[model samples]
Target: AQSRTLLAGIVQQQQQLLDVVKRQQELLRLTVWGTKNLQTRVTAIEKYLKDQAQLNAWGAAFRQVAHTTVPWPNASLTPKWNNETWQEWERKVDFLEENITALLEEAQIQQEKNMYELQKLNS
Candidate 1:
């Protein structure tokens, strides 16, 4: 039960992080729709899901060996599990944040160039 929850939490967090990146990519000058980096992110996201499948396999084996029905703890709602999950999530979130920051820097540069050119036209 715990294993399933952990895997699910990890995947969910990763997806959310990617979604944020995708959203920003759409909103900013950068187009992530068909770029190589966007493809890489999608591939990494798929790999993460596959990793969950592996986790499930190991979890099932552990469950079988234990020979006891482990009760499901509150799923990401309780402070105990929530904190643990959030900590795990932050690990990946940090990576996503780095990506976003890089995109933001690029956007700022592009915007500045456009604004400077527009000012030159007005002058």
Candidate 2:
């Protein structure tokens, strides 16, 4: 049936979404863990960057060398940064992980539901 076809499509796509979410969460989480180490300066620097006048400061800090090997303003030319603005930045990234986690769980539920529907439909 066409309805069954659509359900199968949903199951496939939801699986992909689940994979993408896991990837994003892991990378974000790993970076958070890594930054906690003494090897990273972002912890201290984030505070100073709070000043709005600190746009100039961001360029110096956000750079390229080894780490994650990634992003923005052409990774080579522009380094990155901020400070509550800094707190906001930190807060939001953490917030993002939380939201993604929520979405991930929600997605899994959908996957389970749809898969069950598929089974029931075929049965």
Candidate 3:
């Protein structure tokens, strides 16, 4: 039970971090859409999800827990699992979200600059 909750928490934060990146693509001022390096960074940073050996160990632990599917009884499978894993994961997510926000805002600043520059040139 604790492990499942911990897993879900990690996943939830992952989506939150992703949403932080997706919301800043308001590039319709001149075109229907535009691309930014920030967007590419999204998928590129996701390498930790699959390629990391740490995650492999976590997966091995997960498989050891037989899926009881709520046998109408105690599905409580709380192993020695320390929450330090979650803390580290949470810290990374928080930093990522902050980093994304910083990058997005910098990109938005540039967007405004370029858009105004183009209009000035067109003037």
Candidate 4:
């Protein structure tokens, strides 16, 4: 009779622990799902911002270049004539590239983290 009671208690404790672990897994799933969604959204926003900035900067630059009444200087004027407006556009493009790269890297890291956490939960 004593042995029966002891076994019953052990079984009950095991069930409780299982229940707690299950609940924890569910909560973790929800959190990871939300985090994954957020990462996707942030990645999209970052790309859009980068594209918009580049487009705006280029638009202004081309406008300036087109409106300038000054003609390209002659061959000898190469020493004096530098296309500062186009140069500015090139710089903006470079900046946009860097920004996009960093954003993508961050998104990738977040995605990996989510996956790793999920595997851990399952294990």
Candidate 5:
């Protein structure tokens, strides 16, 4: 009888933990949208920079070079070129999104395992 009571308590605690994990997953889902939107904006800004570079005198210099690269603005050289900062920011967001997705997947698996244990105990 004592063992049965302990099993029931374990099941209840696991269920509560599962519930918290599910809630965290939902909150992460909402947070992912913010990252996605920022990533989209970053892409747009990159395109704008490329387009502007293609139309400027830099384009002529680029055309003369055999191995031309996009003349990304450097903030160290010009104080007005802070948009380059977003490059690293976007990369960090990408990594964060991947890590969060991986964690959510693990949480889902853990929740399912808990449910299975509870079902087995109740049976």
Candidate 6:
């Protein structure tokens, strides 16, 4: 009876862990979508800009975005076993998201400045 109770507890804990993982998966999916949106927007904005430095920044941002999606260590398994490994993966994703967002904002600012220059030239 005691063994059966212990087994039941373990199963319950495993179920709880699965639930947590599912929630995290959904949240991560949303974050990836946002990141991709930012990347696409920045790419479109960069097409009009001529600055090499800004182009390099966009390249770096895209590289980081790509790196974020690469399969993590032992990624073949369902849930990563090592906490540090998972945390490291999350950190990279977070970094990519932040970097892309900053790049998008900077690109927009540059575009606005270019428009101002053009307007001044025409005037």
Q: Which number leads on lDDT?
A: 5
Question: In candidate 1, what are the lDDT values of residues 13-115, reduced to their tens digit?
Answer: 6556656766775665354335636746765676565545443323455535553343333222244885687578757856876887897777667655655
Task: Return the TM-score for each candidate structure.
Answer: 0.31, 0.50, 0.38, 0.42, 0.42, 0.36
lDDT of 5 by residue, 1-123 (tens): 437667667767876876787788779779978977896786677666666655434344554654444656632233345457756776887798789779778877876787677667666
Question: Which residue runs does candidate 3 get wrong by more than 4 Å?
Answer: 1-80
Off by over 4 Å in 2: 1-10, 35-83
Residue-wise C-alpha lDDT for candidate 4, range 13-120, written one tens digit per residue? 655665565577568658767966885786667655554444322334553555323333222322223457646765886786578568656755765565555456
State candidate 2's TM-score. 0.50
Arranged by lDDT, best first: 5, 2, 6, 1, 4, 3
Better candidate by lDDT, 1 or 3: 1
What TM-score should be assigned to candidate 1? Answer: 0.31
Off by over 4 Å in 1: 1-87
Cα RMSDs, all models: 22.6, 15.7, 24.1, 18.5, 10.0, 30.6
Best TM-score goes to which candidate?
Answer: 2
Worst ten in a row by lDDT for model 5: 74-83
For model 6, residues 1-123, the per-residue Cα lDDT tens digits are 335546445555655665665577678789878976895786555544433323332344653554223222321222466457757877997897688668656755765565555456454
Worst 10 residues of 4 by lDDT: 71-80
Model 1 poorest 10 in a row by lDDT: 68-77
Off by over 4 Å in 5: 1-80
Better of 5 and 6 by lDDT: 5
**Cα deviation of 4, candidate 1, in Å:** 57
